[PDB]
Design a protein around this ligand. Structure first.
Ligand SMILES: C[C@H](Nc1ccc2ncc(CO)cc2c1)C(=O)Nc1ccc(Cl)c(N(C)C)c1
Ligand SMILES: C[C@H](Nc1ccc2ncc(CO)cc2c1)C(=O)Nc1ccc(Cl)c(N(C)C)c1
Ligand SMILES: C[C@H](Nc1ccc2ncc(CO)cc2c1)C(=O)Nc1ccc(Cl)c(N(C)C)c1
Ligand SMILES: C[C@H](Nc1ccc2ncc(CO)cc2c1)C(=O)Nc1ccc(Cl)c(N(C)C)c1
Ligand SMILES: O=c1[nH]cnc2c1ncn2[C@@H]1O[C@H](COP(=O)(O)O)[C@@H](O)[C@H]1O
Ligand SMILES: O=c1[nH]cnc2c1ncn2[C@@H]1O[C@H](COP(=O)(O)O)[C@@H](O)[C@H]1O
Ligand SMILES: O=c1[nH]cnc2c1ncn2[C@@H]1O[C@H](COP(=O)(O)O)[C@@H](O)[C@H]1O
Ligand SMILES: O=c1[nH]cnc2c1ncn2[C@@H]1O[C@H](COP(=O)(O)O)[C@@H](O)[C@H]1O
Lengths: 328, 328, 328, 328
């Protein structure tokens, strides 16, 4: 007899059920509480990846009503500088910045708080690690009002641990990333739809929102992640290759590409075995057109489910479980 | 814990069980009640699509014992004209015409009723939308005897809503269309076999028939949709590319093709994000040969299940659930 | 709610469980009762197909300890002649011959019985059809000692019907054939492993053996069909393309091929829509080498399961159910 | 009704659950008890295959903290010589050697014990065969202290049989090998994750460790096999093509390859039908780099699950069951 805790579902395992609706897709309210104090106009966070979010992308997404997360794969001074560029920009834009859970990050957090960061992201592949929880407790004691997102977890016990450590928001995702090889390398992972619903159920009545991070391929996946209980989603692949993302555009056969790699790739690493792949992603153009298309998809879902707000989608919308023949 | 209402099955998930039979495939009765007043000789409806049904196809299918649905992607006057061409044609052929649920369709319904339409199709991607139900209630009050089909729904609550609004027949199908991207864009959908059986169970004892719309690839799918409880099926892909369908025949490498696109495709649309693809379908030839082949398949099923009539197939025939290995 | 009788399994859904064994693969007894009076040395029957069994193949398989079934796609006189060639051949070989269930087959049965046929196969795509059962009852009354195999069925009720009609053996298989399109055309079919076990359970205590017909791709499938309860298997694809099979060998790119088609293919038919495909199968060489390889596989299974006889394999060997990941 | 003992899971069916952790991947203890008297530094055994383990590979793996198994596809004198080369080498390296269960192996066991073998592997495709169990009982009586591994089994009854016969360790694996065709040829097999957990549950409280043999493709599979209860894993494919493995390196299109075949392949055999394939595997380079990468994967798992030792991973780590959509 094997120690199987439960069956766990991914995005492709389920579909949302259409319901009675007075909701017009164009009248749908996409605003969401990222934390008890931070409200975003769209439920979109950009990944803290060296091929996804630097100041230029963080600015564009904030303009669309989301929030960007400056990656930790640069010097403390260079990151605080990226935070200042987003913060100093006209329009009163909000920004986030990622920090490691390792020793010698107290200095980085200090520089980011001074640079005006709205939300500190304690960025770990294992949020339930005691060293991540200690770092959170240390940051919360020093900065009692700082908005902190901690992750990543994929269990109810993991979400509770982060909430007890002082997290303002909990990030969910162990193995779902499009560039992730954690599942194959370590054998560990939790299918995202179950991971999100478990974390949300654990955090019921706490006012601590859940972020569904990784595995979002289509706008239907955004809707599913929210109906599973996530207040917002974090995307890497969806925003990689856009004009606003870091790095230069490459020309291969005549088609335009941009780099996209996991933060656990050999390339991004330069002592652990890699948990991410390095690849090319087709050039997507301007972030504005991508967000318009993806949010439109979500809007159309809200019309089909009769959910006029993110909160209604999170708590009212129902799913049906489908087979492999259902999927194809 | 996720809000999973139930498991939902598609055509590939099931197979019909052979049973004791005195039914010869050639003696099988294919007639069905589309509504309490309209009886078709074959259980086949053509899709209200701009690449499937105009007067020429509607005439050919009516001649085979089915019914065509003139699409709403043309002016009010041009549609009433298409209705008159089918109606005025010799042989006393029946015709249907699709109308949108939006404002400024009262004028279209008036012109179609005057042009002699036998069945008005209130054509929506979301039949459970309050604005669709209101339009149905408005049409039923003005025309107490007009045959109205409303859709699309995929739940028991959705079928009941349409029946209460005054529908003569309920159309089922949320996401099963061969050209549909609703499932990927919105994340909403119900596998067709479950959607049909739920709607039929809801409408038991009402005399309001269910139309299984979308996803029919083979004649076996027609049989499955009927045994799931549908009185008839609606097909797009199956009749696209036929000589009688609208548009011109294209030559690519030496092979003959015709256009086939969703009514929610960018092309068909010209404010929502697209929910349909634009594609080429191989030229199928004359509609008569397709119907003979597809109905022959259904006839052979009726012989194997011991169901001599559509009503027997709808209520007696049993299924077995199969795995993915069952499918392949 | 859908009328789902049960879940049904195919060969790929299961695996046999290894067990304590005193059985050496080389000492395994492959003999089986085809009927209460006919005992075969190997549990192998060749398909009654115009691309599989004529006198030459029927002779070779009988020599290996199996039995061939001369197909009904030839004149009454020409079939009786094929029966005489196998019967008159030295060695006291047993032969079978297939007859249709249609009117004007009384003459064919008379000629086959006179020609010395050991087993009459009443060959139908639907054994549960009243016209098949009547034909069996008519043959049993006229020939009280004639060995009759009737089929095909795939249910417990279907197996009982054939046994009550007077069948000496029941043939199982609705939709499993490698060249079969019945499932796609009609939507009817029962996954073979469940179909066989249902028929065997129905016929428990009757002494009427079950033949698993269709879908056997590998020697492991033979073992699975027998452990599901079949006393023997019927193969088409496995023996198609052999030197002994009818038709000439074709040369395509340099590789040798032979024709293999369903008896319900357009080609084999020349009033029903086709339920079979027409294809080329690679030349397999001599039947002797194929049987040695396939029976060796079965022998090895008998060693792994601790089943020294066909009867032990049929009644003792256990299965495990596997997922799609189990299969690949 | 089919004799289905249970549902059985393979590596791809499950994922390990992340948990609270004070474990740093670099501080993780990989040591394991292969037997009550033999402790390995890494839980890795090399396959007793003629394309995987001879003295050179056995030396390299022992140096990494594992143990190699010299294959039985060579003369008694030539195998004892291979055992002496590993044993006589500097560093006090441990070695294993495989023997068949057939008659005329008493001579081979005598020569291997004299040559200084640390662990005798009674190597069979069917550990539950009475002739394998007798050979074990004969060896245990003659050598009361000799470390004996017997296999392969895949059931609780099979593991108990080997433990009762006197085995120091039980090897599990019926059909999971990357080069195995037993499942297709015989129809027998047990998905590895269930096979391992069943054998471990059977052997609870006996101090007799289980070896998970076959099917390990990635480092995540090692972790899964251990959490299923295996004390160690046996790998063929993972070490085939390495510089230390037997045979010469071949050049095909410009890429370097090495031979990899099942011990039941036609080639390795030269009276049974083959149960293995013959193939080329890409040249992997030095064994040291492969082990560093694979153990790193395991180390990372130990950090994610909060299991600081092999024993903790074997008994504390939990799984989630995933769908086919979960897998892809
Ligand atoms: C190589 C890998 N790289 C990454 C980097 C970013 C990631 N971001 C998200 C996820 C989600 O599965 C995994 C990630 C893996 C990684 O950090 N492994 C890893 C494995 C086990 C432990 Cl205990 C730790 N402790 C927390 C430092 C790290
Ligand atoms: C773009 C799309 N296009 C279509 C067009 C024809 C269709 N026909 C059938 C189906 C069935 O899923 C979907 C279809 C989508 C479409 O209408 N989306 C859509 C999504 C949500 C709502 Cl609330 C509405 N309200 C009813 C106007 C429309
Ligand atoms: C076209 C087809 N052809 C065949 C021919 C050989 C077959 N042999 C076996 C099987 C097993 O599914 C199907 C076969 C279909 C065929 O006979 N259909 C078919 C379908 C329904 C009925 Cl009621 C009948 N009645 C018995 C004459 C025949
Ligand atoms: C041809 C085959 N070859 C091998 C060789 C190595 C293997 N090693 C492991 C496994 C695990 O399924 C299968 C293997 C098959 C093989 O031994 N078959 C086989 C089948 C049934 C029995 Cl009763 C026996 N008795 C034990 C001698 C052998
Ligand atoms: O190398 C890596 N391994 C595993 N997960 C990663 C890696 N790098 C980033 N991630 C995660 O993958 C997410 C992006 O997933 P995507 O949106 O599916 O591409 C990020 O937000 C991280 O949570
Ligand atoms: O763009 C679209 N999106 C979704 N469904 C569509 C679209 N256009 C038409 N449909 C549906 O798809 C059906 C045709 O499906 P088919 O027979 O599987 O090709 C139509 O009768 C409509 O119900
Ligand atoms: O056209 C056909 N349709 C369906 N089944 C067929 C047809 N012709 C033969 N069969 C069946 O298929 C079996 C051969 O299956 P195979 O061994 O999997 O190739 C025959 O013994 C018949 O029972
Ligand atoms: O021909 C064969 N048939 C079946 N299993 C085999 C054969 N040769 C070796 N094996 C098994 O396959 C294992 C290697 O599996 P791998 O690590 O998945 O490649 C060996 O340790 C044996 O247990």
């Amino acid at each position: 007899s094997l120690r199987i805790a439960k069956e766990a579902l991914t995005f492709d395992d389920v579909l949302l059920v259409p319901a009675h609706s007075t909701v017009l897709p164009n009248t749908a309210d996409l605003s969401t509480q990222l934390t008890k104090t931070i409200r975003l106009n769209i439920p979109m966070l950009s990944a803290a990846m060296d091929t996804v979010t630097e100041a230029r992308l963080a600015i564009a997404l904030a303009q669309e009503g989301g929030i960007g997360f400056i990656h930790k794969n640069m010097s403390i001074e260079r990151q605080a500088e990226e935070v200042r560029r987003v913060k100093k920009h006209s329009g009163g834009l909000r920004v986030g910045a990622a920090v490691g859970a390792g020793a010698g990050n107290e200095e980085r957090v200090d520089a980011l708080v001074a640079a005006g960061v709205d939300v500190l992201l304690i960025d770990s592949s294992h949020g339930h690690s005691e060293g991540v929880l200690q770092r959170i407790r240390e940051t919360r004691a020093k900065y009692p009002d700082l908005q902190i997102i901690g992750g990543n977890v994929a269990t109810a016990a993991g979400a509770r641990a982060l909430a007890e450590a002082g997290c303002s928001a909990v990030k969910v995702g162990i193995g779902p990333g499009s560039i992730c090889t954690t599942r194959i390398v370590t054998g560990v992972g939790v299918p995202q739809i179950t991971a999100v619903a478990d974390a949300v159920e654990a955090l019921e009545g706490t006012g601590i929102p859940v972020i569904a991070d990784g595995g979002i391929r289509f706008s239907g996946d955004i809707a599913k992640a929210i109906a599973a209980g996530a207040s917002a989603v974090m995307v890497g692949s969806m925003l990689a290759g856009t004009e606003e993302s870091p790095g230069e555009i490459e020309l291969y056969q005549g088609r335009s590409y941009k780099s996209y790699r996991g933060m656990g790739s050999l390339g991004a690493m330069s002592k652990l075995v890699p948990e991410g792949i390095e690849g090319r992603v087709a050039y997507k153009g301007r972030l504005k057109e991508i967000i318009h298309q993806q949010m439109g998809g979500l809007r159309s879902c809200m019309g089909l489910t009769g959910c006029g707000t993110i909160d209604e989608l999170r708590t009212k919308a129902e799913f049906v479980r489908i087979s492999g023949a259902g999927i194809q």
